[PDB]
Design an enzyme around this catalytic site. Structure first.
Site, PDB file in Angstrom:
ATOM      1  N   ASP A 119       0.829  -1.199   0.000  1.00  0.00           N
ATOM      2  CA  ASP A 119       0.000   0.000   0.000  1.00  0.00           C
ATOM      3  C   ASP A 119       0.881   1.275   0.000  1.00  0.00           C
ATOM      4  N   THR A 157      -6.791   3.488  -2.352  1.00  0.00           N
ATOM      5  CA  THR A 157      -6.555   2.091  -2.081  1.00  0.00           C
ATOM      6  C   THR A 157      -7.555   1.089  -2.602  1.00  0.00           C
ATOM      7  N   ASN A 178     -12.899   5.166  -1.950  1.00  0.00           N
ATOM      8  CA  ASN A 178     -12.776   4.603  -0.599  1.00  0.00           C
ATOM      9  C   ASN A 178     -14.138   4.712   0.086  1.00  0.00           C
ATOM     10  N   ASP A 306      -0.281  -0.113  -5.099  1.00  0.00           N
ATOM     11  CA  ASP A 306      -1.612   0.297  -5.516  1.00  0.00           C
ATOM     12  C   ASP A 306      -1.628   1.799  -5.939  1.00  0.00           C
ATOM     13  N   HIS A 307      -0.716   2.605  -5.389  1.00  0.00           N
ATOM     14  CA  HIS A 307      -0.675   4.072  -5.650  1.00  0.00           C
ATOM     15  C   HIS A 307       0.525   4.624  -4.906  1.00  0.00           C
ATOM     16  N   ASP A 685     -20.208   6.309 -21.639  1.00  0.00           N
ATOM     17  CA  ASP A 685     -19.783   4.946 -21.261  1.00  0.00           C
ATOM     18  C   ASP A 685     -18.399   4.566 -21.857  1.00  0.00           C
ATOM     19  N   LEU A 687     -17.670   4.245 -24.981  1.00  0.00           N
ATOM     20  CA  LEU A 687     -17.904   3.397 -26.133  1.00  0.00           C
ATOM     21  C   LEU A 687     -18.704   4.138 -27.206  1.00  0.00           C
TER      22      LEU A 687
HETATM   23  C1  LIG Z   1     -14.426  -2.307 -19.499  1.00  0.00           C
HETATM   24  O1  LIG Z   1     -14.679  -3.697 -19.419  1.00  0.00           O
HETATM   25  C2  LIG Z   1     -15.995  -4.116 -19.116  1.00  0.00           C
HETATM   26  C3  LIG Z   1     -16.125  -5.659 -19.133  1.00  0.00           C
HETATM   27  O2  LIG Z   1     -15.979  -6.160 -20.475  1.00  0.00           O
HETATM   28  C4  LIG Z   1     -16.998  -3.433 -20.073  1.00  0.00           C
HETATM   29  O3  LIG Z   1     -18.242  -3.507 -19.427  1.00  0.00           O
HETATM   30  C5  LIG Z   1     -19.146  -4.388 -20.093  1.00  0.00           C
HETATM   31  O4  LIG Z   1     -19.850  -3.694 -21.109  1.00  0.00           O
HETATM   32  C6  LIG Z   1     -20.768  -4.541 -21.792  1.00  0.00           C
HETATM   33  C7  LIG Z   1     -21.290  -3.840 -23.044  1.00  0.00           C
HETATM   34  O5  LIG Z   1     -22.003  -2.683 -22.664  1.00  0.00           O
HETATM   35  C8  LIG Z   1     -21.902  -4.955 -20.825  1.00  0.00           C
HETATM   36  O6  LIG Z   1     -22.849  -5.787 -21.481  1.00  0.00           O
HETATM   37  C9  LIG Z   1     -24.194  -5.554 -20.974  1.00  0.00           C
HETATM   38  O7  LIG Z   1     -24.546  -6.476 -19.943  1.00  0.00           O
HETATM   39  C10 LIG Z   1     -25.825  -6.318 -19.351  1.00  0.00           C
HETATM   40  C11 LIG Z   1     -25.980  -7.368 -18.259  1.00  0.00           C
HETATM   41  O8  LIG Z   1     -25.014  -7.033 -17.294  1.00  0.00           O
HETATM   42  C12 LIG Z   1     -24.970  -7.952 -16.173  1.00  0.00           C
HETATM   43  O9  LIG Z   1     -24.170  -9.117 -16.404  1.00  0.00           O
HETATM   44  C13 LIG Z   1     -22.751  -8.929 -16.467  1.00  0.00           C
HETATM   45  C14 LIG Z   1     -22.050 -10.265 -16.765  1.00  0.00           C
HETATM   46  O10 LIG Z   1     -21.927 -11.094 -15.625  1.00  0.00           O
HETATM   47  C15 LIG Z   1     -22.231  -8.213 -15.200  1.00  0.00           C
HETATM   48  O11 LIG Z   1     -20.839  -7.962 -15.245  1.00  0.00           O
HETATM   49  C16 LIG Z   1     -22.987  -6.898 -14.971  1.00  0.00           C
HETATM   50  O12 LIG Z   1     -22.447  -6.243 -13.824  1.00  0.00           O
HETATM   51  C17 LIG Z   1     -22.710  -4.811 -13.789  1.00  0.00           C
HETATM   52  O13 LIG Z   1     -23.826  -4.467 -12.985  1.00  0.00           O
HETATM   53  C18 LIG Z   1     -23.733  -4.884 -11.624  1.00  0.00           C
HETATM   54  C19 LIG Z   1     -24.951  -4.338 -10.898  1.00  0.00           C
HETATM   55  O14 LIG Z   1     -26.064  -4.999 -11.445  1.00  0.00           O
HETATM   56  C20 LIG Z   1     -22.443  -4.442 -10.910  1.00  0.00           C
HETATM   57  O15 LIG Z   1     -22.166  -5.313  -9.830  1.00  0.00           O
HETATM   58  C21 LIG Z   1     -21.195  -4.358 -11.806  1.00  0.00           C
HETATM   59  O16 LIG Z   1     -20.294  -3.445 -11.185  1.00  0.00           O
HETATM   60  C22 LIG Z   1     -21.519  -3.980 -13.273  1.00  0.00           C
HETATM   61  O17 LIG Z   1     -21.845  -2.589 -13.350  1.00  0.00           O
HETATM   62  C23 LIG Z   1     -21.364  -1.881 -14.526  1.00  0.00           C
HETATM   63  O18 LIG Z   1     -22.045  -2.199 -15.762  1.00  0.00           O
HETATM   64  C24 LIG Z   1     -23.403  -1.748 -15.911  1.00  0.00           C
HETATM   65  C25 LIG Z   1     -23.974  -2.094 -17.291  1.00  0.00           C
HETATM   66  O19 LIG Z   1     -23.920  -3.488 -17.527  1.00  0.00           O
HETATM   67  C26 LIG Z   1     -23.511  -0.237 -15.657  1.00  0.00           C
HETATM   68  O20 LIG Z   1     -24.874   0.139 -15.615  1.00  0.00           O
HETATM   69  C27 LIG Z   1     -22.819   0.186 -14.350  1.00  0.00           C
HETATM   70  O21 LIG Z   1     -22.744   1.591 -14.272  1.00  0.00           O
HETATM   71  C28 LIG Z   1     -21.402  -0.375 -14.186  1.00  0.00           C
HETATM   72  O22 LIG Z   1     -20.501   0.400 -14.960  1.00  0.00           O
HETATM   73  C29 LIG Z   1     -24.505  -7.190 -14.911  1.00  0.00           C
HETATM   74  O23 LIG Z   1     -24.854  -7.902 -13.734  1.00  0.00           O
HETATM   75  C30 LIG Z   1     -26.924  -6.452 -20.401  1.00  0.00           C
HETATM   76  O24 LIG Z   1     -28.133  -6.100 -19.762  1.00  0.00           O
HETATM   77  C31 LIG Z   1     -26.675  -5.548 -21.629  1.00  0.00           C
HETATM   78  O25 LIG Z   1     -27.586  -5.860 -22.685  1.00  0.00           O
HETATM   79  C32 LIG Z   1     -28.379  -4.696 -23.072  1.00  0.00           C
HETATM   80  O26 LIG Z   1     -27.963  -4.112 -24.309  1.00  0.00           O
HETATM   81  C33 LIG Z   1     -28.236  -4.945 -25.435  1.00  0.00           C
HETATM   82  C34 LIG Z   1     -27.436  -4.507 -26.664  1.00  0.00           C
HETATM   83  O27 LIG Z   1     -26.469  -5.494 -26.931  1.00  0.00           O
HETATM   84  C35 LIG Z   1     -29.753  -4.974 -25.673  1.00  0.00           C
HETATM   85  O28 LIG Z   1     -30.069  -5.864 -26.719  1.00  0.00           O
HETATM   86  C36 LIG Z   1     -30.514  -5.431 -24.420  1.00  0.00           C
HETATM   87  O29 LIG Z   1     -31.835  -4.941 -24.526  1.00  0.00           O
HETATM   88  C37 LIG Z   1     -29.903  -5.002 -23.067  1.00  0.00           C
HETATM   89  O30 LIG Z   1     -30.625  -3.884 -22.580  1.00  0.00           O
HETATM   90  C38 LIG Z   1     -25.205  -5.575 -22.126  1.00  0.00           C
HETATM   91  O31 LIG Z   1     -24.931  -6.680 -22.965  1.00  0.00           O
HETATM   92  C39 LIG Z   1     -21.315  -5.633 -19.571  1.00  0.00           C
HETATM   93  O32 LIG Z   1     -22.302  -5.758 -18.556  1.00  0.00           O
HETATM   94  C40 LIG Z   1     -20.127  -4.854 -18.999  1.00  0.00           C
HETATM   95  N1  LIG Z   1     -19.433  -5.600 -17.961  1.00  0.00           N
HETATM   96  C41 LIG Z   1     -18.981  -5.058 -16.825  1.00  0.00           C
HETATM   97  C42 LIG Z   1     -18.273  -5.984 -15.860  1.00  0.00           C
HETATM   98  O33 LIG Z   1     -19.120  -3.862 -16.520  1.00  0.00           O
HETATM   99  C43 LIG Z   1     -16.707  -1.961 -20.346  1.00  0.00           C
HETATM  100  O34 LIG Z   1     -17.485  -1.489 -21.432  1.00  0.00           O
HETATM  101  C44 LIG Z   1     -15.225  -1.689 -20.642  1.00  0.00           C
HETATM  102  N2  LIG Z   1     -15.000  -0.262 -20.681  1.00  0.00           N
HETATM  103  C45 LIG Z   1     -14.436   0.343 -21.753  1.00  0.00           C
HETATM  104  C46 LIG Z   1     -14.263   1.850 -21.682  1.00  0.00           C
HETATM  105  O35 LIG Z   1     -14.081  -0.302 -22.762  1.00  0.00           O
HETATM  106  O1  LIG Z   2      -5.725  -7.985   2.840  1.00  0.00           O
HETATM  107  C1  LIG Z   2      -5.696  -7.581   1.658  1.00  0.00           C
HETATM  108  N1  LIG Z   2      -5.177  -8.290   0.574  1.00  0.00           N
HETATM  109  C2  LIG Z   2      -5.266  -7.717  -0.790  1.00  0.00           C
HETATM  110  C3  LIG Z   2      -4.242  -8.373  -1.746  1.00  0.00           C
HETATM  111  C4  LIG Z   2      -4.402  -7.758  -3.146  1.00  0.00           C
HETATM  112  C5  LIG Z   2      -5.806  -7.998  -3.722  1.00  0.00           C
HETATM  113  C6  LIG Z   2      -6.895  -7.397  -2.810  1.00  0.00           C
HETATM  114  C7  LIG Z   2      -6.710  -7.800  -1.323  1.00  0.00           C
HETATM  115  O2  LIG Z   2      -6.163  -6.354   1.329  1.00  0.00           O
HETATM  116  C8  LIG Z   2      -6.265  -5.400   2.385  1.00  0.00           C
HETATM  117  C9  LIG Z   2      -7.632  -4.743   2.335  1.00  0.00           C
HETATM  118  C10 LIG Z   2      -8.215  -4.420   0.948  1.00  0.00           C
HETATM  119  C11 LIG Z   2      -9.353  -3.392   1.233  1.00  0.00           C
HETATM  120  C12 LIG Z   2      -8.680  -2.031   1.511  1.00  0.00           C
HETATM  121  C13 LIG Z   2      -7.684  -2.207   2.676  1.00  0.00           C
HETATM  122  N2  LIG Z   2      -7.827  -3.593   3.320  1.00  0.00           N
HETATM  123  C14 LIG Z   2      -9.255  -3.821   3.775  1.00  0.00           C
HETATM  124  C15 LIG Z   2     -10.176  -3.693   2.524  1.00  0.00           C
HETATM  125  C16 LIG Z   2     -11.159  -4.796   2.473  1.00  0.00           C
HETATM  126  C17 LIG Z   2     -11.881  -5.766   2.442  1.00  0.00           C
HETATM  127  C18 LIG Z   2     -12.688  -6.948   2.409  1.00  0.00           C
HETATM  128  C19 LIG Z   2     -13.341  -7.973   2.450  1.00  0.00           C
HETATM  129  C20 LIG Z   2     -13.990  -9.291   2.508  1.00  0.00           C
HETATM  130  C21 LIG Z   2     -13.240 -10.214   1.523  1.00  0.00           C
HETATM  131  N3  LIG Z   2     -14.010 -10.325   0.238  1.00  0.00           N
HETATM  132  C22 LIG Z   2     -15.198 -11.189   0.497  1.00  0.00           C
HETATM  133  C23 LIG Z   2     -15.820 -10.787   1.857  1.00  0.00           C
HETATM  134  C24 LIG Z   2     -15.473  -9.306   2.108  1.00  0.00           C
HETATM  135  C25 LIG Z   2     -15.634  -8.529   0.788  1.00  0.00           C
HETATM  136  C26 LIG Z   2     -14.545  -9.011  -0.207  1.00  0.00           C
HETATM  137  C27 LIG Z   2     -15.112  -9.093  -1.624  1.00  0.00           C
HETATM  138  O3  LIG Z   2     -15.536 -10.425  -1.955  1.00  0.00           O
HETATM  139  C28 LIG Z   2     -15.761 -10.621  -3.299  1.00  0.00           C
HETATM  140  O4  LIG Z   2     -15.176  -9.911  -4.145  1.00  0.00           O
HETATM  141  N4  LIG Z   2     -16.678 -11.626  -3.644  1.00  0.00           N
HETATM  142  C29 LIG Z   2     -17.643 -11.508  -4.778  1.00  0.00           C
HETATM  143  C30 LIG Z   2     -17.058 -10.567  -5.870  1.00  0.00           C
HETATM  144  C31 LIG Z   2     -17.725 -10.706  -7.252  1.00  0.00           C
HETATM  145  C32 LIG Z   2     -17.779 -12.182  -7.675  1.00  0.00           C
HETATM  146  C33 LIG Z   2     -18.718 -12.914  -6.698  1.00  0.00           C
HETATM  147  C34 LIG Z   2     -18.144 -12.899  -5.261  1.00  0.00           C
HETATM  148 CA   LIG Z   3     -21.443   5.726 -25.711  1.00  0.00          CA
HETATM  149 ZN   LIG Z   4      -3.543   6.072   1.967  1.00  0.00          ZN
END
Ligand SMILES: *[C@@H]1O[C@H](CO)[C@@H](O[C@@H]2O[C@H](CO)[C@@H](O[C@@H]3O[C@H](CO[C@H]4O[C@H](CO)[C@@H](O)[C@H](O[C@H]5O[C@H](CO)[C@@H](O)[C@H](O)[C@@H]5O[C@H]5O[C@H](CO)[C@@H](O)[C@H](O)[C@@H]5O)[C@@H]4O)[C@@H](O)[C@H](O[C@H]4O[C@H](CO)[C@@H](O)[C@H](O)[C@@H]4O)[C@@H]3O)[C@H](O)[C@H]2NC(C)=O)[C@H](O)[C@H]1NC(C)=O
Ligand SMILES: O=C(NC1CCCCC1)OC[C@@H]1C[C@@H]2CCN1C[C@@H]2C#CC#C[C@@H]1CN2CC[C@@H]1C[C@@H]2COC(=O)NC1CCCCC1
Ligand SMILES: [Ca+2]
Ligand SMILES: [Zn+2]
Ligand code: NA
Ligand code: NA
Length: 804
Positions: A119, A157, A178, A306-307, A685, A687
């Site tokens: 860190d 972080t 954070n 991390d930073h 977004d 894109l």
């Molecule tokens: C950086 O990299 C990432 C990963 O590749 C890119 O993000 C992807 O972008 C695509 C294209 O837009 C997204 O596809 C759409 O998916 C949704 C369904 O999404 C669900 O399933 C996926 C897969 O498991 C999850 O990852 C999604 O998770 C998001 O939402 C949850 C909360 O529900 C959250 O925990 C996550 O943080 C994550 O949030 C982020 O994404 C959403 C949008 O998806 C956004 O609103 C939010 O602000 C966050 O930024 C989720 O559970 C699907 O519904 C869509 O279909 C729609 O459009 C089609 C057109 O094809 C229509 O036909 C249809 O009617 C639908 O309305 C999309 O296919 C993908 O989700 C997304 N993945 C992630 C992880 O974010 C980025 O684009 C890249 N960035 C750059 C700059 O390149």
């Molecule tokens: O010790 C480590 N090692 C690191 C090694 C390098 C990689 C990251 C961890 O980090 C120091 C941590 C980091 C965070 C900031 C400072 N300090 C406490 C914080 C916190 C927290 C914290 C927590 C717990 C551990 N998991 C699980 C329980 C909670 C939340 C978290 C997140 O868990 C999923 O990501 N599961 C999901 C995620 C999406 C897929 C489905 C399952």
């Molecule tokens: Ca756009």
């Molecule tokens: Zn700090």
């Protein structure tokens, strides 16, 4: 209900479900450990190091670690056992020897990966603290290292550690700071507290999950703060002695230091030497431990921060109370960035537009700039999440913002902080990779931490979940296990129109003084329209269009373009300016000239009437008339197909760039190839927008207004060769300028462009890859370079910071 026991369970790998007590490395954080956790799992008796008199001792189960004869077979010796008791040397004292192949014990299916994350470890510590970090300096000089690694924004972080784990920008993984409020959950998230434990905050797929889903076992990555570092290392070493079928392949160690101390003492406080010595000693223990297990030429080790950390004190705080009168109707997320929202949603008098106006250029020395999040530089990728508030404050390095002075003395204490713009030198952090899979004694250029997830996947034979890294861009770090990327397929092929329309078919309300108008020079004109100088202006092949659309390639003497019949303007325009090229003016008689293009129908053309009728909107050109090769070639630059919509305030920026800066860069870089074009990103977004996402058109028309304009400026890295005759590696800088109806972002804008334009462009520097995402185009398709090398070029960011 913690009445069970940790007997034989210390640092168990799966956490057992409530209300049975836990013995995993996280139980302390949930206050849920079994009653005997400390006694059994957190032994401290006799400390962490073998001494001469403990050698051959009789096993005493109470000791923290062991020096008895059987400790190797039990896998629980102190890390220095062989050194003190068997006359072995410390890992750090051994010469380095190239690890050409993994040298693993029988039963190891792949080299394990250990992530050692630190860190607050600023990039310049590698040089400045070198005298006190012999273990880390050896990892660095023997393995593969970058001069620094760029974190993501905000350079806090939580966003950074989760970016390292997922390969995703914070906007996509959801950990956008954070601290955070989510209006849909109606819930808050804080670094301290128990709400961070709720899984709905955490998006994407982190490395431990990717691994598990694909049958690669993982150590638990997270450590309760009160587990001492020596015990964390000993646990990792014990897990590595487990039987083949239970032993994890990937582990993480985490250090709270040097961040903890950097906050108190500043990045270079004399108090900072001790924390660096101690981290190094931890690295020493790990490597001594691995060498005992015969794993020191088997494990890949990543040392990664991390930073960084910057000097920040109390007295360098701006207050929103010195700017705003409605200070009590807002909530500020404060410090090294600002996010502002309304205190209450029932108050409909709060107005974001007037908040921003009240914070814009109000004092000559102002130490932060307000932005609507969609206007932030696109390189930050910090807008597409409901948790990011509409109003953002980019804070100058070395400063804080706070709401009221009371918040700072009743809610100095600190000499360091971080969170600033991720281009800032003090925010940069470190990367070293050491082991059989990394290169030997190899320096690589700086890269972004979003790229690491792919490489960690590669290191473990995993298929990465979709992420923001560009897979293959970091192949040059690896001896083997490279992933062999291929170029995306072109989706749309271009049309090549010839002369198909007569001038009188056009009713565009456009006029040009061009009838002031020979098989010497008409023979020439025909070749130029077929692509005879195309070799000069399109150096790296045509960009590929990766989506379904209709477009035309248009050749000209001085430039080539890909003209969209859907958006009525080029998607890209390509031209080369040699070091010897001359700048000319736009002749008086051609000031308002716009010429119909007889290759493109009236229905697929812009019209001048729309601009005349639109009081807010003017127009500019993508290939600049100033850089025409001759008076006759200049008429090409006034074609309606080279025209794009520009606010007059923007025209000032664009004209200065085209008239002055392009030629300056050609002078300095020995020629440049420029590709310019529009970007539409109305839903912020990152894109390319489809047509039905466009929120603004030139009044009365179907001419869509870009949100941004880009340019990609490529030349030869060896600048003794001219851009158009380059034999080796390329050099690139790019930008994505926001297309804004005012220049309020630039406080000095009423002065001469030479005082502010270039500073604006630098703020809006970009990777070619960012432009790719924003346009659905793929550049550098035809070069003599390896594709991996081109992927690296596409992820390059020119930062304009001095040298670290
Ligand atoms: C950086 O990299 C990432 C990963 O590749 C890119 O993000 C992807 O972008 C695509 C294209 O837009 C997204 O596809 C759409 O998916 C949704 C369904 O999404 C669900 O399933 C996926 C897969 O498991 C999850 O990852 C999604 O998770 C998001 O939402 C949850 C909360 O529900 C959250 O925990 C996550 O943080 C994550 O949030 C982020 O994404 C959403 C949008 O998806 C956004 O609103 C939010 O602000 C966050 O930024 C989720 O559970 C699907 O519904 C869509 O279909 C729609 O459009 C089609 C057109 O094809 C229509 O036909 C249809 O009617 C639908 O309305 C999309 O296919 C993908 O989700 C997304 N993945 C992630 C992880 O974010 C980025 O684009 C890249 N960035 C750059 C700059 O390149
Ligand atoms: O010790 C480590 N090692 C690191 C090694 C390098 C990689 C990251 C961890 O980090 C120091 C941590 C980091 C965070 C900031 C400072 N300090 C406490 C914080 C916190 C927290 C914290 C927590 C717990 C551990 N998991 C699980 C329980 C909670 C939340 C978290 C997140 O868990 C999923 O990501 N599961 C999901 C995620 C999406 C897929 C489905 C399952
Ligand atoms: Ca756009
Ligand atoms: Zn700090
Ligand atoms: Na005219
Ligand atoms: Na106008």
């Amino acid at each position: 209900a913690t009445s069970g026991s940790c007997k034989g369970r210390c640092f168990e790998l799966q956490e057992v479900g409530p209300p049975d007590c836990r013995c995993d490395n996280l139980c302390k954080s949930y206050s849920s450990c079994c009653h005997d956790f400390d006694e059994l799992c957190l032994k401290t008796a006799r400390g962490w190091e073998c001494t001469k008199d403990r050698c051959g001792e009789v096993r005493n189960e109470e000791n923290a670690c062991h020096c008895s004869e059987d400790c190797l077979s039990r896998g629980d010796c102190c890390t220095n056992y062989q050194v003190v008791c068997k006359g072995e040397s410390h890992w750090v004292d051994d010469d380095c020897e190239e690890i050409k192949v993994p040298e693993c014990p029988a039963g190891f299916v792949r080299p394990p990966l250990i992530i050692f994350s630190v860190d607050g470890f600023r990039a310049s510590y590698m040089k400045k603290g070198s005298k006190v970090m012999p273990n880390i300096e050896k990892l660095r000089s023997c393995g593969t290292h970058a001069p620094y690694m760029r974190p993501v924004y905000p350079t806090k972080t939580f966003p950074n550690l989760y970016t390292l784990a997922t390969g995703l920008y914070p906007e996509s993984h959801g950990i956008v700071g954070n601290s955070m409020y989510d209006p849909v959950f109606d819930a808050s998230f804080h670094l301290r507290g128990r709400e961070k434990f709720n899984h709905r905050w955490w998006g994407g797929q982190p490395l431990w999950i990717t691994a598990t889903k694909q049958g690669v076992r993982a150590g638990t990555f997270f450590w309760s703060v009160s587990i001492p570092h020596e015990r964390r290392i000993l646990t990792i070493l014990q897990w590595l002695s487990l039987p083949d079928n239970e032993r994890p392949s990937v582990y993480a160690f985490y250090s709270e230091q040097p961040d903890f101390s950097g906050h108190k003492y500043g990045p270079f406080g004399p108090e900072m030497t001790n924390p660096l010595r101690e981290i190094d000693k931890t690295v020493g223990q790990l490597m001594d431990g691995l060498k005992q297990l015969r794993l020191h030429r088997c494990v890949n080790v990543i040392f990664v921060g991390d930073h960084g950390m910057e000097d920040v004190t109390c007295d360098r705080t701006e207050f929103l109370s010195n700017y705003l009168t409605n200070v009590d109707d807002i909530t500020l997320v404060p410090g090294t960035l600002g996010r502002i929202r309304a205190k209450s949603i029932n108050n409909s008098k709060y107005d974001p537009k007037t908040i921003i106006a009240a914070l814009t250029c109000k004092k000559p020395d102002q130490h932060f700039k307000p932005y609507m999040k969609q206007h932030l530089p696109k390189r930050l990728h910090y807008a597409n999440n409901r948790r990011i508030e509409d109003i953002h404050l980019l804070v100058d390095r070395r400063w804080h913002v706070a709401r009221k002075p009371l918040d700072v003395y009743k809610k100095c204490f600190f000499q360091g902080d971080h969170g600033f713009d991720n281009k800032v030198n003090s925010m940069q952090t470190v990367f070293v990779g050491y082991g059989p899979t990394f290169k030997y004694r190899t320096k690589v250029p700086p890269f972004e931490n979003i790229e690491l997830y792919n490489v960690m996947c590669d290191l473990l034979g995993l298929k990465p979940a979709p992420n923001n890294g560009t897979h293959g861009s970091l192949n040059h770090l690896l001896r083997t296990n490279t992933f062999r990327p291929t170029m995306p397929d072109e989706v749309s092929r271009p049309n090549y129109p010839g002369i198909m329309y007569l001038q009188s078919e056009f009713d565009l309300g456009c006029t040009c003084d061009d009838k002031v108008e020979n098989k010497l020079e008409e023979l020439n004109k025909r070749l130029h329209t077929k692509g005879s100088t195309k070799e000069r202006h399109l150096l790296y092949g045509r960009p590929a269009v990766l989506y379904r659309t209709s477009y035309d390639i248009l050749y000209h003497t001085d430039f080539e373009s890909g003209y969209s019949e859907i958006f009525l303007m080029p998607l890209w325009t390509s031209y080369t300016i040699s070091k010897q090229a001359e700048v000319s003016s736009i002749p008086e008689h051609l000031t308002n000239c716009v010429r119909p293009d007889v290759r493109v129908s009236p229905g697929f053309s812009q019209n001048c009437l729309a601009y005349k009728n639109d009081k807010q909107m003017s127009y500019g050109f993508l290939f600049p008339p100033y850089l025409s090769s001759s008076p006759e070639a200049k008429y090409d630059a006034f074609l309606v197909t080279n025209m794009v919509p520009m606010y007059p305030a923007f025209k000032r920026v664009w004209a200065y760039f085209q008239r002055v800066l392009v030629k300056k860069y050609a002078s300095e870089r020995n020629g440049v190839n420029v590709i310019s074009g529009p970007i539409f990103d109305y839903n912020y977004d990152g894109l390319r927008d489809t047509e039905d996402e466009i929120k603004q058109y030139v009044e009365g028309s179907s001419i869509p207004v870009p949100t941004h304009y880009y340019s990609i400026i490529t030349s030869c890295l060896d600048f003794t060769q001219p851009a158009d005759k380059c034999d080796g590696p390329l050099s690139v800088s790019s930008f994505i300028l926001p297309h804004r109806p005012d220049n309020d972002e630039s406080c000095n804008s009423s002065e001469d462009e030479s005082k502010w334009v270039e500073e604006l462009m630098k703020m809006h520097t970009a990777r070619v890859r960012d432009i790719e995402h924003l346009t659905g185009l793929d550049f550098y398709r035809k070069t003599s370079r390896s594709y991996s090398e081109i992927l690296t070029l596409k992820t390059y960011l020119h930062t304009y910071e001095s040298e670290i």
